[PDB]
Design a protein around this ligand. Structure first.
Ligand SMILES: Nc1ncnc2c1ncn2[C@@H]1O[C@H](COP(=O)(O)OP(=O)(O)OP(=O)(O)O)[C@@H](O)[C@H]1O
Ligand SMILES: Nc1ncnc2c1ncn2[C@@H]1O[C@H](COP(=O)(O)OP(=O)(O)OP(=O)(O)O)[C@@H](O)[C@H]1O
Ligand SMILES: Nc1ncnc2c1ncn2[C@@H]1O[C@H](COP(=O)(O)OP(=O)(O)OP(=O)(O)O)[C@@H](O)[C@H]1O
Ligand SMILES: [Mg+2]
Ligand SMILES: [Mg+2]
Lengths: 384, 67, 1095
């Protein structure tokens, strides 16, 4: 993410500083400087575009200031599906930090492509022999192959995969490693298309992504759960204030909560839904099991009390309101209405404080440091 | 390649032999060979102690290691 | 003999048949091959099968036979279960054929018990009569079903008081009936009272609920027991609900296990386990040590009518071992808990992810077969996998995310000790349970808060449970009141405290709580007298503490400084116990770090998948078999006298805790008998994790148990035992050891600079041994001299012994200074010890006149065994020979080229009693090299003993550069510990064969450079305290010139016309040596090292 922002800023500068005039260069450069806390002083604005950037910087919306470059200039993004679809290569490498895995994305892609996936972890000689045999078969009969934790077998990676990748159509091969593990051989890396897996840094983006993967009360509960998951995952990134530690919530928690909600709705036909039971279960067993502190359990309980209050009209975030379903609608109509509610929402520049119910000043330091790193790195890159 | 090589060299220079190489039945093979060679030279050595002490003396005389 | 060889050559070929034999009765996976052979063989005896029911099932102890027909089974706790229909046995029936029938018949019998017990209870029958009719499991399940139904009925309205009062009356009735019941009935009632107290808590909580919605929410969180009324399949007619989900009872025999108290943490964990098992996932518990994870998993299994199988994971569990265990538990249909799941290697954790995911998928889609490890096996739909792990402890790896996503995690950081203590006290019979439990919890918190921050102070759940366990046998001698609790607290917690913490403990005990052992102290004193120790207050206190700790805890840790009194303590206590009780003692002492983990436990021959027992496994198996009945009435002690490496020790986590089971990679399960206690003798707890400190009772040695006077008395009375002369000699020597004169010497020696620093308390052994040997060696010439001369010679010998035992590891300057103090503190009337005093054959003379002028030949300078006799050389040779003849280990320390090898070889060259075995130690030396260097010098004679090849000469091990071998990652050295074992215990274990070898006539000497030199490594004082240490410094420049003038004279004998120039050449050579040493130091280049070897 950080290098994504750095690349966006640097490429925007490299393009504009040639295409645009000189005063534009001075203005953008002093904007970057005040972001980087190296030089201070108002830019000598006359254009229209830089007005929004100046507004973001003055109101200390540092994250919005960073995203301004990407939003203004570049008009497309690529997810893993796009990368696999729009590539001539047959080998892919997916890297991530520890504490996060993305094989479920590959499984979803395989299902969406009507392929066959063979997940082969690499820990021991039996798995290595199985992998060799599977690769030999799949280069003839097609089918996808996923190699997991390839840094546990570095010697085999450096010999067999190196010789093999160095030297069918429906055959693809994936390889997952860790960004903080041991170094992989650079020649082997260059033959494969590289992707870094990570969660979406937005909040509405996360809700949209979760919603785009799915009676009427089931739809309503799924929408509420998507909002809850996005809110809690966004809150986990503020380690001193949002939580007391660094936790991680993933697709498994979402699946378990969804299954519990379906069971509650199915086995309790009264439509007098025990929202208290749902609140306690999701706050303690599904999302609260990982939590060992007591303050953080209280935080999760407060979030559950806010989201799953079970009221007719709910203002999930300070901007939008969700009317609970009627008694005369269909599932398709409910999906359409909730998708419309999602579409009309606009994320304010102070989402991390206004939507997570947090004091703005605490968020300000975190945003300031995050923007300072990127701006200083861009200044370092642009002077050479 | 490995520290065990340096350990073997340490044993070879500190002593005049490597006891790890010669034991089990290799010790008996070496004893037979030493008996034969010592008889060939007309020397009367019977106990195993004399045999091996001649072995290590010959090694000390006829081995130079250059690093 | 050879017939055993013929049996063995076909025994290996049978493994491929045994593996397919296990496919018929899957519970054979818990048995070794040697037991499968016995089970198959016993076609007609049918009694070899009854010895294995514990291994195969867990809760069954033996079968009940009646004239070739199965009648029933007996639980471990002695309960008897009678089958519905007897199983008629035929000779042609193989073991598996009737075992498979018995397995289902037990389930049917349990269901029938439950059915008619529930039918009786539904007719207004009270709980206090059915306890004499049915097994505990049936009463438990029926009571739970009725409680569920009645609470639902009361939920139909708002009335709970009536049912609550009925429950209270039932609790009181059971409590009163507890006293007047037999042991089996006592166990039944004690187990039932836990669930009845849980019922009362739930009903009271419902009673306090304000509204119906709150009561319904509370009801949805507890476990509910229902029963279908439509299904004709009886074994699936009972299911369990909690938080909406459902699980099926299994009607498997569990016996009467110890049952846990229902606490909120336990119920929330139950909810998480149910939630995970609903989707056929795994269950995970994590947190600190001793918080109930394993025990709550087992309790969850018990409530669902099935015994949870527990494996203790380890790094030796490679991919195939884990996969085979998974195949076994999937074919059986059991619930496997993999305790300490972190201890596996990262690679194996990554590799088993596919197998775990495959198991989950097969369970979800209802597959019939699963292909783990190259063969398609059936998959029982009752299996489940649980893991418990400790994050953030030493020697533990991290689960990869692709594996973490296959489990549901629950945190169990902090249990509720108050509820546990209160309920356990209430059941145990105490009058004021609430106040007592609150006081105990408050006192434990106060200890954890106010006491020093020692690394080993834990006062968690295990400490509370130990305190409670010590109350059961103390009620008779102290009464069910505060006094019993206080005395048990002293019995459990005090032995682990330091010095000030003891005062803090006493103050807190006085503030919080209000307020005969002669038969054993007499035995202790008798044992101390037999072994020659002195029963002071500290030693007696430590002995009594050890005696009271082992009364209830099966594994003790003894921590203290080197040579503080640990071994004497536990040896004396076990001798006193043998005297007191009449039970024999069998003692095995294992120096842990000398052996590798494979030698300690075992290793599969992967070329054959054949198990080979380690030393500890062999000992445990031999005890469990008990062929000759020897171990029936004995106490067995296994002493781990080494460092507490986490990886060596946490492989016995299941052994130490309530499981009492040693789990092996091949699946074997060797029980731990109650008369099998384990000891840990150590000197520090630096790398030990709280996982093992909490399992064992700990005994802390804050200071020495003995004074210098009593230690000297013990040493003298031991040295005399190794000899009319004696009666006079004892008086003379004991008189010459005047502690009034000696204490000043001992405290003055502390100001000297000692290389390889060893406490003064540890050099008394060397002093006494050397003095006694020297005095004894002159006994022929004692008949014919006066009292004055005898006193003078004995005084001189003792002064020499003190000089070389207290100051021997210091420079000649320090030795000369110390001789003055030795002379002045014995008085000036006695014989004066000089720098070179000696005894001649009897008169007193000096080494100075004994210097022999030598004249080498010209060609003799090339011989590496030519030593030019000076004063220092003669003195050092004499002292080294005297120490060697005293059968005491020696270590010679000095800078390179000082001459240690020179004096050693010169002294042992002119002798006909000794041989030299030069062994070289480098940075990477193993004990195999030491044993290899002895192969051509020694014999193996049979128990097993190792002797020199010769029958006259003793053997001496020249072990040089003993500083060099590196420490492992936990700060221990294999080779130094092996040498310590050789000198102290005079033996070692032959690892591949598990036999004790005794060293007969082998001495050990060492040579090393000071530890300040680069690459030198500190030594454990447990090793150096067994060896006398002599320091040996560079000769002076004058001495060097005097030495090398003789070499130059010998050389110049070849060129006589220049003989007048011998002195200037030697002076120039020594001057050049000094200048080169001064200028080119190691601060410029590392290899700028100069010594007399260059001269
Ligand atoms: N609810 C309970 N009621 C009674 N005793 C309990 C309860 N929970 C735990 N205990 C007791 O407390 C101790 C907990 O030990 P346990 O093996 O369960 O801990 P653990 O988490 O496995 O520790 P480790 O991580 O070191 O293996 C045992 O003596 C157990 O019997
Ligand atoms: N009560 C006692 N009376 C007399 N001497 C004692 C007494 N207790 C210990 N000693 C002496 O202390 C010496 C120390 O050996 P001990 O068996 O106590 O070692 P340890 O405590 O096991 O230490 P380590 O095994 O680490 O060297 C014993 O050899 C014995 O002579
Ligand atoms: N009195 C002496 N007579 C003969 N040589 C002497 C004398 N004093 C010192 N030396 C010389 O000192 C050297 C001692 O070397 P030696 O190997 O014995 O030392 P060391 O203490 O064993 O050192 P290292 O730690 O290297 O083993 C020899 O070269 C020896 O000739
Ligand atoms: Mg455990
Ligand atoms: Mg000891």
């Amino acid at each position: 993410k950080k290098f994504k922002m750095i690349m966006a800023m640097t490429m925007f500068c490299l393009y504009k500083f040639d295409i645009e005039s000189e005063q534009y260069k001075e203005a953008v450069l002093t904007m970057i400087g005040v972001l980087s806390e190296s030089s201070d002083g108002v830019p000598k604005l006359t254009n229209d575009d830089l007005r929004y950037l100046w507004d973001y910087v003055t109101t200390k919306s540092y994250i919005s200031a960073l995203n301004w470059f990407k939003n203004e200039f570049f008009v497309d993004e690529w997810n893993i599906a796009d990368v696999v679809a729009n590539s001539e290569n047959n080998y892919f490498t997916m890297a991530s930090e520890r504490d996060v895995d993305g094989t479920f994305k590959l499984i979803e892609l395989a299902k969406a492509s009507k392929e066959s996936l063979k997940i082969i972890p690499l820990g021991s000689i039996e798995n290595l022999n199985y992998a060799q045999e599977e690769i030999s078969k799949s280069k003839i009969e097609g089918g996808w192959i996923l190699l997991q934790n390839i840094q546990m077998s570095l010697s085999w990676v450096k010999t067999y995969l190196h010789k093999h990748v160095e030297e069918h159509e429906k055959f693809k091969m994936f390889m997952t490693c860790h960004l903080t593990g041991d170094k992989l051989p650079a020649p082997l890396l260059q033959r494969t298309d590289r992707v870094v897996y990570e969660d979406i840094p937005g909040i509405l983006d996360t809700v949209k992504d979760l919603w785009g993967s799915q009676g009427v009360w089931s739809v309503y509960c799924t929408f509420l759960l998507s909002w809850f998951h996005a809110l809690i995952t966004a809150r986990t990134r503020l380690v001193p204030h949002g939580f007391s530690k660094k936790y991680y919530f993933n697709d498994c928690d979402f699946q378990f909560a969804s299954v519990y909600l379906e069971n509650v709705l199915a086995t309790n036909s009264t439509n007098n839904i025990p929202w208290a039971q749902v609140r306690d279960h999701i706050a303690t067993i599904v999302y609260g099991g990982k939590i060992d502190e007591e303050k953080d359990l209280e935080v999760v309980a407060k979030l559950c009390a806010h989201v799953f209050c079970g009221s007719d009209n709910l203002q999930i975030v300070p901007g939008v309101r969700i009317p609970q379903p009627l008694l005369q609608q269909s599932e398709e109509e409910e999906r359409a209405r909730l998708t419309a509610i999602l579409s009309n929402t606009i994320e304010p520049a102070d989402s991390l404080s206004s939507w997570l119910q947090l004091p703005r000043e605490s968020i300000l330091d975190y945003e300031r440091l995050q923007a300072k790193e990127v701006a200083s790195s861009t200044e370092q890159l642009l002077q050479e | 390649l490995e520290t065990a090589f340096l350990e073997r060299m340490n044993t070879l220079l500190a002593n005049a032999d490597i006891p790890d190489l010669f034991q089990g039945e290799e010790y008996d093979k070496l004893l037979n060979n030493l008996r034969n060679k010592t008889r060939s030279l007309g020397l009367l050595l019977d106990t195993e102690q004399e045999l091996y002490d001649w072995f290590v003396g010959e090694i000390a005389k006829n081995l130079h290691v250059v690093f | 003999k050879l017939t055993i060889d013929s049996l063995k050559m076909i025994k290996s070929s049978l493994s491929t048949f045994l593996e397919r034999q296990r496919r018929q009765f899957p519970r054979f996976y818990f048995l070794g091959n040697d037991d499968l052979l016995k089970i198959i063989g016993s076609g007609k005896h049918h009694d070899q099968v009854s010895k294995f029911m514990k291994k195969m099932f867990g809760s069954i102890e033996s079968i009940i036979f009646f004239e070739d027909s199965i009648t029933g089974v007996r639980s471990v706790e002695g309960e008897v279960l009678n089958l519905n229909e007897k199983i008629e046995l035929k000779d042609s029936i193989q073991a598996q054929e009737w075992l498979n029938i018995l397995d289902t018949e037990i389930k049917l019998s349990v269901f029938t018990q439950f059915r008619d017990c529930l039918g009786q209870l539904k007719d207004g029958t009270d709980i206090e009569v059915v306890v004499s009719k049915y097994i505990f499991q049936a009463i438990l399940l029926s009571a739970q079903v009725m409680w569920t139904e009645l609470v639902e009925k009361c939920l139909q309205t708002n009335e709970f008081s009536k049912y609550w009062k009925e429950v209270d009356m039932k609790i009181k009735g059971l409590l009163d009936k507890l006293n007047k019941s037999s042991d089996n009935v006592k166990k039944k009632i004690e187990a039932l009272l836990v669930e009845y107290l849980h019922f009362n808590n739930v009903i009271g909580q419902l009673k306090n609920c304000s509204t119906k919605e709150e009561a319904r929410l509370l009801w949805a969180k507890v476990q509910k027991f229902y029963q279908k009324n439509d299904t004709l399949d009886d074994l699936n007619s009972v299911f369990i609900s909690q938080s909406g989900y459902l699980l099926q009872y299994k009607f498997e025999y569990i016996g009467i296990p110890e049952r846990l108290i229902y606490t909120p943490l336990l119920l929330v964990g139950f909810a998480t386990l149910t939630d995970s098992l609903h989707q056929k996932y795994g269950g995970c518990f994590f947190g600190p040590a001793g918080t109930g994870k394993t025990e709550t998993v087992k309790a969850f299994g018990q409530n669902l009518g099935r015994v949870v199988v527990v494996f203790n994971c380890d790094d030796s569990f490679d991919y195939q071992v884990l996969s085979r265990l998974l195949v076994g538990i999937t074919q059986i249909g059991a619930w496997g808990c993999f305790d300490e799941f972190n201890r596996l290697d990262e690679k194996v954790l990554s590799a088993v992810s596919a197998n775990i995911q495959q198991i989950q998928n097969g369970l979800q889609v209802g597959k019939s077969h699963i292909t783990l490890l190259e063969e398609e096996t059936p998959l029982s739909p009752h299996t489940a996998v649980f893991i418990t792990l400790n994050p953030g402890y030493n020697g533990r790896s991290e689960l990869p995310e692709n594996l973490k996503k296959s489990f549901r995690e629950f945190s169990m950081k902090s249990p509720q000790s108050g509820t546990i203590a209160e309920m356990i006290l209430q059941i145990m019979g105490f009058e004021d349970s609430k106040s007592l439990a609150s006081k105990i919890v408050h006192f434990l918190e106060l200890l954890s808060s106010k006491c020093s921050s020692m690394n080993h102070y834990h006062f968690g759940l295990r400490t509370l449970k130990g305190v409670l366990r010590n109350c059961s046998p103390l009620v008779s001698e102290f009464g069910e009141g505060e006094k019993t609790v206080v005395e048990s607290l002293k019995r459990v917690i005090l032995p682990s405290l330091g010095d000030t913490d003891e005062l803090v403990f006493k103050d807190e005990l006085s503030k919080i709580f209000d307020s005969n052992s002669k038969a054993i102290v007499q035995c202790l004193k008798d044992a101390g007298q037999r072994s020659g120790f002195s029963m002071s207050e500290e030693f007696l206190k430590k002995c009594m503490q050890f005696y009271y700790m082992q009364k209830t805890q099966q594994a003790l840790i003894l921590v203290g400084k080197a040579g503080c009194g640990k071994t004497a303590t536990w040896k004396t206590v076990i001798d006193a116990m043998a005297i007191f009780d009449g039970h024999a003692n069998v003692v095995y002492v294992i120096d842990t770090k000398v052996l590798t983990k494979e030698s300690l436990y075992g290793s599969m021959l992967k070329a054959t998948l054949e198990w080979r027992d380690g030393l500890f496994t062999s000992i445990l198996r031999r005890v469990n078999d008990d062929i000759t009945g020897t171990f029936k009435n004995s106490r067995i002690w296994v002493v781990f006298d080494s460092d507490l490496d986490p990886e060596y020790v946490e492989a016995m986590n299941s052994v130490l805790d309530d499981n009492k089971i040693l789990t092996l990679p091949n699946g074997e399960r060797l029980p731990i008998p109650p008369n099998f206690r384990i000891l840990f003798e150590t000197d520090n707890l630096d790398h030990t994790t709280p996982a093992t400190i909490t399992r064992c009772g700990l005994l802390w040695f804050s200071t020495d148990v003995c004074s210098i006077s009593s230690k000297i008395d013990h040493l003298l009375n031991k040295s005399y035992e190794a000899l009319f002369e004696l009666d006079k000699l004892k008086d003379l020597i004991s008189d010459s050891f005047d502690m009034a004169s000696l204490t000043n010497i001992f405290t003055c020696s502390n100001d000297l600079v000692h290389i390889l620093g060893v406490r003064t308390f540890n050099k008394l052994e060397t002093a006494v041994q050397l003095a006694v040997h020297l005095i004894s060696s002159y006994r022929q010439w004692f008949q014919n001299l006066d009292d004055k001369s005898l006193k003078d010679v004995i005084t001189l010998l003792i002064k020499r012994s003190l000089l070389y035992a207290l100051a021997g590891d210091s420079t000649g300057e320090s030795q000369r200074a110390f001789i003055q103090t030795i002379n002045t503190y014995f008085g000036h009337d006695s014989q004066e010890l000089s720098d070179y005093s000696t005894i001649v054959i009897l008169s007193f003379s000096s080494f100075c006149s004994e210097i022999p002028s030598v004249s080498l030949e010209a060609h003799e300078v090339m011989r590496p065994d030519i030593v030019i006799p000076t004063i220092d050389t003669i003195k050092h040779e004499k002292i080294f020979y005297d120490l060697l003849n005293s059968k005491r280990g020696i270590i010679l320390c000095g800078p390179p080229g000082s001459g240690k090898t020179m004096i050693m070889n010169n002294a042992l060259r002119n002798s006909s009693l000794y041989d030299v075995v030069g062994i070289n130690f480098s940075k990477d030396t193993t004990t195999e090299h030491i044993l290899s260097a002895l192969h051509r010098h020694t014999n193996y004679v049979t128990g097993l003993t190792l002797l020199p090849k010769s029958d006259i000469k003793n053997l001496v091990l020249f072990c040089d550069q003993i500083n060099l071998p590196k420490l492992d990652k936990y700060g221990s050295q294999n080779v130094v510990l092996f040498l310590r074992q050789l000198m102290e215990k005079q033996g070692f274990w032959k690892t591949p064969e598990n036999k004790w070898v005794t060293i007969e006539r082998i001495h050990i000497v060492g040579a090393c450079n000071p530890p300040t030199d680069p690459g030198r490594i500190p030594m454990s004082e447990r090793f150096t305290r067994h060896a006398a240490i002599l320091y040996l410094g560079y000769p002076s420049g004058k001495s060097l010139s005097q030495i090398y003038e003789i070499y130059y004279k010998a050389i110049f004998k070849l060129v006589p016309e220049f003989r007048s120039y011998t002195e200037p050449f030697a002076r120039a050579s020594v001057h050049l040596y000094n200048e080169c040493k001064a200028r080119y130091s190691t601060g410029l280049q590392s290899h700028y090292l100069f010594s007399p070897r260059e001269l």
